[PDB]
Amino acid sequence: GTFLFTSESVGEGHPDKICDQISDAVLDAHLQQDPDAKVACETVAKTGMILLAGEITSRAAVDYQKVVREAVKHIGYDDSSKGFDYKTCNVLVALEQQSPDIAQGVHLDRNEEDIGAGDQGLMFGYATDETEECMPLTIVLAHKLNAKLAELRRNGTLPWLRPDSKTQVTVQYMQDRGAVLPIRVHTIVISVQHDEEVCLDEMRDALKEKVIKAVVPAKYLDEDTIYHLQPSGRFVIGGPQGDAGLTGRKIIVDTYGGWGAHGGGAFSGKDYTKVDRSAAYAARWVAKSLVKGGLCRRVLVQVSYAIGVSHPLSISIFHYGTSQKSERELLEIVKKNFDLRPGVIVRDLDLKKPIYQRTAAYGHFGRDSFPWEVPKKLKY
Amino acid sequence: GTFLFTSESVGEGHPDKICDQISDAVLDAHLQQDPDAKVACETVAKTGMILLAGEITSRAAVDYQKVVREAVKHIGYDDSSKGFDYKTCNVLVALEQQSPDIAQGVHLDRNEEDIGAGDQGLMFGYATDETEECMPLTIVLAHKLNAKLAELRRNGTLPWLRPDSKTQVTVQYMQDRGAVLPIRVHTIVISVQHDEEVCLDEMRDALKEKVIKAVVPAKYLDEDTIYHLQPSGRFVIGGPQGDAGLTGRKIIVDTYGGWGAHGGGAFSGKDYTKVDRSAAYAARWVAKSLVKGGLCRRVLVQVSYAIGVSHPLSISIFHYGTSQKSERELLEIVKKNFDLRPGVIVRDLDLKKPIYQRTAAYGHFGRDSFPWEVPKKLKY
Ligand SMILES: C[S@@+](CC[C@H](N)C(=O)[O-])C[C@H]1O[C@@H](n2cnc3c(N)ncnc32)[C@H](O)[C@@H]1O
Ligand SMILES: C[S@@+](CC[C@H](N)C(=O)[O-])C[C@H]1O[C@@H](n2cnc3c(N)ncnc32)[C@H](O)[C@@H]1O
Ligand SMILES: CCn1cc2c(n1)c(=O)n(-c1cccnc1)c1cc(Cl)ccc21
Ligand SMILES: CCn1cc2c(n1)c(=O)n(-c1cccnc1)c1cc(Cl)ccc21
Ligand SMILES: [Cl-]
Ligand SMILES: [Cl-]
Numbered sequence: 001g002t003f004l005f006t007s008e009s010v011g012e013g014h015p016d017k018i019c020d021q022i023s024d025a026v027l028d029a030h031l032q033q034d035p036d037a038k039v040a041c042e043t044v045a046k047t048g049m050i051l052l053a054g055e056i057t058s059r060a061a062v063d064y065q066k067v068v069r070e071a072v073k074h075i076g077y078d079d080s081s082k083g084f085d086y087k088t089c090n091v092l093v094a095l096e097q098q099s100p101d102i103a104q105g106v107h108l109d110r111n112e113e114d115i116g117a118g119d120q121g122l123m124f125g126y127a128t129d130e131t132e133e134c135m136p137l138t139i140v141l142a143h144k145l146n147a148k149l150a151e152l153r154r155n156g157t158l159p160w161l162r163p164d165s166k167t168q169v170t171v172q173y174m175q176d177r178g179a180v181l182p183i184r185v186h187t188i189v190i191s192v193q194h195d196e197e198v199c200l201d202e203m204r205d206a207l208k209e210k211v212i213k214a215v216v217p218a219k220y221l222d223e224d225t226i227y228h229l230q231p232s233g234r235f236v237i238g239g240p241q242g243d244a245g246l247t248g249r250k251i252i253v254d255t256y257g258g259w260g261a262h263g264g265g266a267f268s269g270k271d272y273t274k275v276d277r278s279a280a281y282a283a284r285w286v287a288k289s290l291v292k293g294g295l296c297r298r299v300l301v302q303v304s305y306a307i308g309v310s311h312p313l314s315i316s317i318f319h320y321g322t323s324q325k326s327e328r329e330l331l332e333i334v335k336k337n338f339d340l341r342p343g344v345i346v347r348d349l350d351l352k353k354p355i356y357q358r359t360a361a362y363g364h365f366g367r368d369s370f371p372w373e374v375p376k377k378l379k380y
Numbered sequence: 381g382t383f384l385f386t387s388e389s390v391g392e393g394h395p396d397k398i399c400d401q402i403s404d405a406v407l408d409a410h411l412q413q414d415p416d417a418k419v420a421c422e423t424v425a426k427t428g429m430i431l432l433a434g435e436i437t438s439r440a441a442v443d444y445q446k447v448v449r450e451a452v453k454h455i456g457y458d459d460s461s462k463g464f465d466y467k468t469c470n471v472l473v474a475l476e477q478q479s480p481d482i483a484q485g486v487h488l489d490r491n492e493e494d495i496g497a498g499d500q501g502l503m504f505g506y507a508t509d510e511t512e513e514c515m516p517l518t519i520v521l522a523h524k525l526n527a528k529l530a531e532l533r534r535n536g537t538l539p540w541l542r543p544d545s546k547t548q549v550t551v552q553y554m555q556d557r558g559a560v561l562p563i564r565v566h567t568i569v570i571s572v573q574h575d576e577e578v579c580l581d582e583m584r585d586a587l588k589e590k591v592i593k594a595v596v597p598a599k600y601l602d603e604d605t606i607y608h609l610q611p612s613g614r615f616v617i618g619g620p621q622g623d624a625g626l627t628g629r630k631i632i633v634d635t636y637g638g639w640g641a642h643g644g645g646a647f648s649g650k651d652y653t654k655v656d657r658s659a660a661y662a663a664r665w666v667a668k669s670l671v672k673g674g675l676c677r678r679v680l681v682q683v684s685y686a687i688g689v690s691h692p693l694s695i696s697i698f699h700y701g702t703s704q705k706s707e708r709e710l711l712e713i714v715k716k717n718f719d720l721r722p723g724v725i726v727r728d729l730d731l732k733k734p735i736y737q738r739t740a741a742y743g744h745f746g747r748d749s750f751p752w753e754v755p756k757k758l759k760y
Contacts, residue, residue: 003696003697003707003708004682004694004695004696005682005694005696006502006682006684006693006694006696007502008500008501008502008643008644040623040624042424042624042626044422044424044431044433044626046433046434046474046476047474047476049433049474051424051431053424053426053429053624054426054624055623055624094426094427094429096426096427099617099621099622099623100617101612101614101615101616101617101618101622102612102617102622102623104612104613104614105611105612105613105614105615106612116611116612120388120546120548120569120571121388121548122386122387122388122548122632122638124638166500168500168501168502168684168686168693170684170693170694186694187686187693187694189500189686189687189693191500191687226693228686228689228693231485231496231686231687231688231689232481232482232484232485232486232496232687232688233484233485233688234481234484234485235481235485236481237479237480237481237482238481241479242479242481242482243420243435243479243482244420244422244433244434244435246422246424246626246627246628246629247626248626248629249626249628249629249644249646250644251631251644252502252642252643252644253644258502258504258641258642258643258644258682259641260641261638261639261640261641261642262632262638262641262642263388263632263638264388264629264630264631264632264633264638266629302384302385302386302638304386304548304550306548306567306569306608306611307569307571307611307612308611308612308613309608309611313386313548313550313567313569313606313608314384314385314386314550314566314567315384316383316384316385316386317383327383328383
C-alpha cells in the first residue's frame with residue numbers, strides 16, 4: 001500500500017515567479033482604478049530586463065515603470081551584487097488594447113451575469129482531507145520551505161541568502177479506500193541562490209537546522225530521509241540572469257503539485273473574464289466544499305468552456321473511491337449548488353478585488369481564507 | 381458509469397504554439413552543428429515581434445534571423461493581411477551563455493551516462509488502451525481537427541482560413557474496471573482565424589462538413605452532439621496580434637489533454653539534459669511499454685529529479701485498477717527494465733537528433749513512431 005509522491009515549489013525570486021507577481025501587480029494596479037479592466041499581461045524576465053507583453057483595455061492610468069520596479073523591490077532584487085536591481089533594470093512595454101474581435105464576442109453589450117467565457121478551455125479543482133487546508137502535504141511543505149528561506153533572508157539571520165529558490169518534497173504515503181495518509185518525508189531538495197563568500201558546509205548545515213527543522217515536523221524525518229541541499233554545488237548566479245522567466249510557467253506550483261489534474265491555463269495577469277483563472281478558482285471552491293461538507297475525502301472536478309458562451313460545456317467529478325455517493329450523484333449536487341458562469345463566479349468570489357499579487361507566490365490555494373477557500377454550505 | 385471528459389488542442393499558428401515551434405527550430409539548428417549544445421531558448425510573440433530569450437552554450441553558428449523567419453513562413457504567416465509576416469516582423473535576441481554555475485553542477489567534467497539532471501522537478505508519463513496509439517480520444521480528435529484546418533488552408537480549398545486555431549472535444553465515456561471506453565462526442569468547439577470577407581454561415585457549414593465530418597467518425601456524432609463553431613462570432617484579428625504567445629504555455633496540449641498528470645515543465649527549446657523534456661519522454665515510453673506489454677490497460681508514471689543528481693529521486697505508478705499486478709509489482713518491473721538517468725535516456729531515445737521542431741505542434745506523444753512511442757519489451 002505505500003507509495004511515494006513528489007511536489008515542488010519555488011521562491012518569490014524564482015524568475016518565473018517574478019513574472020507571475022509582476023503580471024498580477026499590473027492587474028491589481030488596473031483593478032484599483034477600473035474594476036472592469038480587461039487584462040492579459042504577460043511578463044518576461046532575463047538579465048537586466050522586464051518586458052510586459054499582452055493586451056489591456058482599461059480606464060486606469062497605470063505607471064508601469066513604478067508598478068514593475070516596486071514589485072521587484074518587494075521580492076528583494078535591489079543590487080547588482082544580487083544579479084538584478086529594481087532601480088536600474090530595463091522595463092520595456094509592448095502592451096496594446098484587447099482585440100476588438102474578442103471584446104465583441106465575450107463581453108461587449110452583455111449583461112454581466114451572462115458574459116461569455118473569455119476563451120475556451122478546461123480547468124480542474126482538487127481537494128484532499130490529508131491536511132486541514134485540504135491540500136497535498138507534499139506541496140504544502142515545499143511552499144513552506146520557500147517561505148522560510150524568504151523569512152530568514154528578510155530578517156537578516158541568513159544574510160547570504162538571495163531571492164531565487166526552489167524546493168522539492170517527496171512524501172511516503174499509505175492509502176485507505178482512496179484517501180491518502182502521509183507517513184514520512186522520503187527526500188527533500190533545496191536549491192537557493194547565495195552570496196560568493198559562504199561555503200557549502202555552512203549553507204547545508206543552515207538549510208537542515210534552520211530551514212527544514214523549522215518547517216517539517218520531526219515525526220516525518222528519520223535516519224533514512226534523503227537530503228539534497230545545494231545539490232548543484234554553486235548557485236551564485238541566479239534570478240533572471242541565471243534563467244529566463246515567463247508568466248505562467250509554474251502552473252503546477254500554483255495549483256496542486258502534480259496531484260489532481262491541470263487544464264493548462266495560467267492564472268497571473270488575467271482578469272476574471274479569463275476562465276483559466278476564475279473557473280479554476282471556482283473549481284477549487286467546489287472541490288473544497290465537497291470535502292469540507294463530508295461528501296468525500298478527496299475529489300477532482302473538471303469544467304470546460306467555449307469562448308463567448310457563459311455556461312460550462314462540461315462538468316465532471318472523480319472521487320477516487322472516497323465517497324459512498326456515486327460520481328453521478330456528486331455531479332448532481334454540484335449542479336444544484338453552483339453556478340459556474342464567469343459573470344456569477346465574479347460575484348461569489350469577489351474577483352474584481354485587487355488581491356491578485358498576493359496569490360502569485362506560494363500557491364493560489366490552501367492559504368489566507370480567500371473566497372475560494374471558504375466552503376459553500378451544500379443543499380442535498 | 382458514464383462521464384464526460386474534455387480536452388483541447390491548438391493549431392500551428394496559435395501564438396503560444398508559434399513560440400514552441402520557433403524554440404525547437406532554434407534547438408534543432410544548434411543540434412545540427414553541435415549535438416552537445418546546451419539550449420534553453422524561450423520565445424515570446426506579440427504584434428510584429430519575435431523575441432528569443434534564454435541561455436545557449438554551443439559550438440554552432442546559427443543565424444537566428446533566418447531560423448525564426450523560416451519557421452514563421454512554414455506556419456503560414458506571410459502577409460500583413462494575415463496579421464503577421466515572416467518577411468517584415470521584428471526578430472529580437474536576448475540570448476546569453478548557460479550559467480557557469482549550472483554548467484559546473486550538471487555536466488562539466490562528468491561522464492555522459494552520469495551527467496546530473498539539468499534541474500530538479502517532477503514529470504509524468506501516461507498511456508491508455510482506448511486508442512491504438514495509447515492516447516486519450518479527446519485530445520487525439522482535438523489535434524486532428526487542427527491538422528485538418530491546416531490541411532484545408534494549405535491546399536487552398538478553404539482559402540479564408542488563417543493559421544491561428546483552437547479546438548476542444550468533449551467525449552462521453554463509460555468505464556470497465558478502470559479502463560475507459562468512448563461512447564460518443566458530446567460537444568465540439570472550433571475557433572479559427574479567418575479573412576474579412578467570409579460570413580459566419582459559410583464558415584460554420586464548412587467547419588461541420590469539411591472539418592468535423594472529415595475527422596470524427598460518424599458513429600460518435602448524433603442529433604444531440606453540441607457544436608460551438610466560431611462561437612465568438614468574429615476572429616479576423618489573430619496570431620500574436622490577437623494574443624501574446626510564449627513558449628511552454630500549452631503544456632497540457634503537448635501531453636495528455638488533462639488526463640494523467642503534469643509536473644509543470646515545458647518541453648520546447650530545451651536539450652536532453654533538461655529532464656523536463658527527456659524524463660517526460662522516457663516516462664511516456666515506460667507507460668506505453670506497460671500498456672503495450674499487456675500489464676495494464678492504463679497507467680500513470682511519476683519520476684522526479686534533483687539538479688546535479690543523475691538517478692531519479694522517486695518513481696511511482698498508478699494503474700487505475702487496470703492490472704492484476706499491484707502498483708508495487710509494476711514499479712519493480714519498471715526499475716528492472718529502465719534506467720532513467722538523463723545520460724542513459726539520451727542514448728535510448730536518441731535525444732541529440734534534431735527532430736524537435738516536429739514535436740512542437742499536434743502533441744509530443746501518440747505520433748510518428750518517435751523513439752518514446754516504440755514500446756520496450758519487458759522482462760519480468
Ligand atoms: C536550473 S535553471 C534551468 C536550466 C537553465 N535554463 C539552463 O540554461 O540550463 C532553472 C531554475 O533553477 C534554479 N537555478 C539557477 N541556477 C542554479 C544553480 N546554479 N543551481 C541550482 N539551481 C539553479 C533557478 O531557480 C532557475 O530558475
Ligand atoms: C481568446 S485569446 C485569450 C484572451 C486575450 N489575451 C484577451 O486579451 O482577452 C486566446 C486564444 O484564443 C484565440 N482567439 C483570438 N482571438 C479570438 C477570437 N476573436 N475569437 C476566438 N478565438 C480567438 C487565439 O488562438 C488566441 O491565442
Ligand atoms: C489511492 C492512493 N493514491 C495513490 C496515487 C494516487 N492516489 C493518486 O491520486 N495519484 C495521482 C496523482 C495525480 C493524477 N492521478 C493520480 C497517484 C499518482 C501516481 Cl504516479 C502514483 C500514485 C498515486
Ligand atoms: C475510471 C474511469 N475514469 C473516470 C475518470 C477517470 N477515469 C480519470 O482518470 N479521471 C482523471 C483524469 C485526470 C486526473 N485524474 C483523474 C477523471 C477525472 C474527472 Cl474530473 C472525472 C472522471 C475521471
Ligand atoms: Cl524552473
Ligand atoms: Cl490560449
